[PDB]
Amino acid sequence: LEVFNLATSQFSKTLLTASSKVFTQSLYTADILSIFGEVFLPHVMQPVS
Amino acid sequence: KTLYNYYSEGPSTPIMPHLVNRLRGLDALAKVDATLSKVDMNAAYIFALRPTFPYSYGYKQRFSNRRLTTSALCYARTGLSSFLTVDKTYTSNSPLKGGSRGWPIFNVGVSPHVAEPHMRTLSPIGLEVFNLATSQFSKTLLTASSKVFTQSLYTADILSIFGEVFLPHVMQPVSNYTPILVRALLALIHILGSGSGNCSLSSSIFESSIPQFLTISHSTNMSNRTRYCLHTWSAYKDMFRNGIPPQSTFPPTLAPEGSSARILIPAALVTSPMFPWLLVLVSSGPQFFLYSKDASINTVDIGSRGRITSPIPDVAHLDLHRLWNLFRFDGYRYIDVVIVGVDRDYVWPYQNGVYVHGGKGPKGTDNYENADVHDGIGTIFSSFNNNVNVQTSDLLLGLSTLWNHITTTYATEEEVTMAIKIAAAFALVYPVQPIVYSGCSRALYNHTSYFQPSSENCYTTDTAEVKSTWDTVELSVQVNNAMVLGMTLPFGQPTVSSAQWFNNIDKAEISMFKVGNLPLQNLDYLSLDMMEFYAPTTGQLYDIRSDSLISSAHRTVNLGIGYTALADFFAYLASVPAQSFYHNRMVTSPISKQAYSVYERFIERFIDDFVGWGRCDLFNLDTLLGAKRIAGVASSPIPWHCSLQRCPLPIIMHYTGLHFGQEHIRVRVEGLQQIVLRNDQGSIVLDALGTAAPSRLAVKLDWSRLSAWYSDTTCAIPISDRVMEIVNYAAIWDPTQERRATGFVYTYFSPNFLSSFNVSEPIFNKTINLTPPYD
């Protein structure tokens, strides 16, 4: 949802709502957000499977 | 409305409200009449930049008995699609077949007027910068900035940049992107080539299609170059610490100034292919010259009967200039490119040997301490280097990306429309107008000052088929100079500047008089949009559904031909003679200045009513009145009776609604006059019947009288003998002339040029049948 917000809105921040750095090497850091916004943008726009 | 509606209206009462409602409708038609995104790219370019204008011809005869005529279709086109000159390396002084010794330079200056900005909306980062500007610090004011993303545009440093060098725009967020859109449209049109496919003064030499490959040539003596200085943000900000140095670009810009500007470009966008095309289109131009890679495979020669000769005889020593070379734009003379978000080891990705101030230095060092100035866009951007060969698609990729991004993210539809309307004034280049002369009958030999038939500026080069008897021009040096000096833009303005690259010497003579002016692009808007300081105008990714590059260029060329046609119509209504736009327009007759005075009123009224831009930037009399009659070249003995007319009649009819159908030809009670002349020995020498030509007021009150006037004074032009049917039956009787009798003038096009009208598309290689249908 926050990746979608980054895709559809100009950056603020208030948009960083779910990501955290508490857990090391998890799937919830900012790097994973970058991965999602880079190589999975259409699925972010239209989530299907 | 539709094209069917407009073809059945005709001119009406006041003709200025007419011809502008028609133009707006025709422009609206061109927006939706063809989805060019579903065809091949070359086909789209052909269909956008070279429109066809179908029409049906035909003539009647007095006594027809089993006469067989073909009622076919023809497709009229106007304008030069490129220019053919002698090779830069060519030492002989012999005249080449179809190759001009030089070429015109349409030098455009800088408009003092400012493109009016319109309101924008702040981004959250910009909103917080605004809060910092208008409130005492708290904090609670830091609402959008973050340090999660490294080297992004959302840290506190970018806030400092905005509050330092863009404060007025923070206070009043506005932007206008019309001038860069104008330059982009012109770049596309001049690189590809708009018009009819004619590519020479010879009127019989055509280029088959868009070139596939281009060549870049540099010329120090002939280019119009901009100086560039590359800095990182830290190095650029550090040179203003100890006072203000000379030529400072630091202060913000509301009204752009031609000398010196700064652009702040994020590091992520420097590697975009649009970036060099961004540096071009705001700089001076041209900084390099563009040629078709080889002129043999594209150029053809067309016969009087439509015989295509593919390899023109002397193509080995000819250069095929793009229209890009015939134009000269004044932009910013000095640009400070400031890359934002880079370290002290930053490397210029383009041309080697180029070091960014505050970046990687020559040997191996960081924080380069020199701010080197590079003269010309070619000294950086190796893709613009001398003798570079490039596919046109690769060249245009950056332009298309730039246009798509700007028109979907930064600009509004109004800005794009204004850019189209302005660019249409410089979209096309036309050769000097050729005219013929019927002459006078033998019975009137003693009552005329112009007895013999004649022609002017009628040049052809094909030798395969029969040459037209009216095409008597031979291309000497002085005649070539005169013909180049007679070339015009859509609104009629010529040039008095020209260039020549002969032997091994390149030379340009640039007059202080300019054919027009263009506004500068405020680069602060560009910087702030590229740093996401504004909210985007739209969230769409693609302009295919709205205001694409090719659709915009098609609209621009459509409006440019419309400007040419309406200008010809105005010159007719203002009785502006064709000879007032020749190389010797100043030394021939005092009619020229009066005609300019009358014509400029029509032009300015139209420009204010339709374009809305300040007239003077699009048309003025500076180049007309600064004529340059060169050495000799005597004008042919033709009376000044035909108007300006750069377009064939069917195109003029399309844009004006003028109807010249066969129903206006009389075939069958007394409105004629018996005209009598006597000599000293009381002997009647004329005793002839005549009819009065209509006054322009009568035409104003009844536009069908102009149609009748066409059908009473027009004859089909013969090809092999200089005797028309008309001169055996009719003549012009002007009582206020010292000698009352003259013939007819008849703006001339050429059978070779008219053969190209025989196919729906401007493609002629070998399988095209240009022969007249059914003989």
PDB file of N, CA and C in Angstrom, chain B residues 103 146 159-160 171 180 192 227 264 318 423 448 519 572 593 601 675 740 747:
ATOM      1  N   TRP B 103      23.089  28.949 -49.614  1.00  0.00           N
ATOM      2  CA  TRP B 103      21.753  28.679 -49.102  1.00  0.00           C
ATOM      3  C   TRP B 103      21.309  29.824 -48.207  1.00  0.00           C
ATOM      4  N   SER B 146      12.638  13.976   4.265  1.00  0.00           N
ATOM      5  CA  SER B 146      13.055  12.731   4.890  1.00  0.00           C
ATOM      6  C   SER B 146      14.490  12.431   4.490  1.00  0.00           C
ATOM      7  N   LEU B 159      15.771  21.401   0.433  1.00  0.00           N
ATOM      8  CA  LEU B 159      15.008  22.503   1.014  1.00  0.00           C
ATOM      9  C   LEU B 159      15.837  23.778   1.046  1.00  0.00           C
ATOM     10  N   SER B 160      17.105  23.662   1.446  1.00  0.00           N
ATOM     11  CA  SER B 160      17.980  24.830   1.458  1.00  0.00           C
ATOM     12  C   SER B 160      18.164  25.394   0.054  1.00  0.00           C
ATOM     13  N   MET B 171       7.287  31.754  -3.574  1.00  0.00           N
ATOM     14  CA  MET B 171       6.230  32.701  -3.235  1.00  0.00           C
ATOM     15  C   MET B 171       5.114  32.676  -4.271  1.00  0.00           C
ATOM     16  N   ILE B 180      10.199  26.544 -25.426  1.00  0.00           N
ATOM     17  CA  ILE B 180      10.909  25.295 -25.679  1.00  0.00           C
ATOM     18  C   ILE B 180      10.062  24.363 -26.540  1.00  0.00           C
ATOM     19  N   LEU B 192      13.428  16.648 -40.208  1.00  0.00           N
ATOM     20  CA  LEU B 192      12.814  15.701 -41.131  1.00  0.00           C
ATOM     21  C   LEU B 192      12.543  16.339 -42.488  1.00  0.00           C
ATOM     22  N   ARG B 227      27.963  28.920 -25.095  1.00  0.00           N
ATOM     23  CA  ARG B 227      29.007  28.499 -24.172  1.00  0.00           C
ATOM     24  C   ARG B 227      28.392  27.804 -22.964  1.00  0.00           C
ATOM     25  N   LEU B 264      19.411  23.851 -13.177  1.00  0.00           N
ATOM     26  CA  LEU B 264      19.709  22.930 -12.088  1.00  0.00           C
ATOM     27  C   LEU B 264      19.079  21.591 -12.441  1.00  0.00           C
ATOM     28  N   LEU B 318      27.217  16.947 -54.585  1.00  0.00           N
ATOM     29  CA  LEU B 318      26.131  17.711 -53.993  1.00  0.00           C
ATOM     30  C   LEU B 318      25.930  17.301 -52.543  1.00  0.00           C
ATOM     31  N   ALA B 423       5.070  28.209 -34.091  1.00  0.00           N
ATOM     32  CA  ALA B 423       6.003  27.460 -34.922  1.00  0.00           C
ATOM     33  C   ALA B 423       5.528  27.390 -36.363  1.00  0.00           C
ATOM     34  N   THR B 448       1.020  48.438 -76.897  1.00  0.00           N
ATOM     35  CA  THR B 448       1.506  47.705 -75.741  1.00  0.00           C
ATOM     36  C   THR B 448       2.951  48.072 -75.442  1.00  0.00           C
ATOM     37  N   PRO B 519      10.579  33.966 -28.074  1.00  0.00           N
ATOM     38  CA  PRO B 519      10.840  34.204 -26.653  1.00  0.00           C
ATOM     39  C   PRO B 519      11.815  33.186 -26.089  1.00  0.00           C
ATOM     40  N   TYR B 572      -3.356  39.060 -52.728  1.00  0.00           N
ATOM     41  CA  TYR B 572      -4.269  39.298 -53.841  1.00  0.00           C
ATOM     42  C   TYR B 572      -5.279  40.389 -53.502  1.00  0.00           C
ATOM     43  N   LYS B 593       6.826  49.613 -51.661  1.00  0.00           N
ATOM     44  CA  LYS B 593       6.633  50.125 -50.304  1.00  0.00           C
ATOM     45  C   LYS B 593       5.156  50.331 -49.988  1.00  0.00           C
ATOM     46  N   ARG B 601      -0.981  45.342 -42.897  1.00  0.00           N
ATOM     47  CA  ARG B 601      -2.207  45.510 -42.121  1.00  0.00           C
ATOM     48  C   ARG B 601      -3.026  44.225 -42.100  1.00  0.00           C
ATOM     49  N   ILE B 675     -14.970  49.936 -77.322  1.00  0.00           N
ATOM     50  CA  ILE B 675     -13.811  50.756 -76.996  1.00  0.00           C
ATOM     51  C   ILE B 675     -13.157  51.208 -78.291  1.00  0.00           C
ATOM     52  N   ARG B 740      -2.113  51.190 -73.546  1.00  0.00           N
ATOM     53  CA  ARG B 740      -3.257  50.628 -72.842  1.00  0.00           C
ATOM     54  C   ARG B 740      -3.283  49.106 -72.790  1.00  0.00           C
ATOM     55  N   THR B 747       1.120  33.066 -62.593  1.00  0.00           N
ATOM     56  CA  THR B 747       2.050  32.337 -61.727  1.00  0.00           C
ATOM     57  C   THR B 747       2.213  30.888 -62.179  1.00  0.00           C
TER      58      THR B 747
END
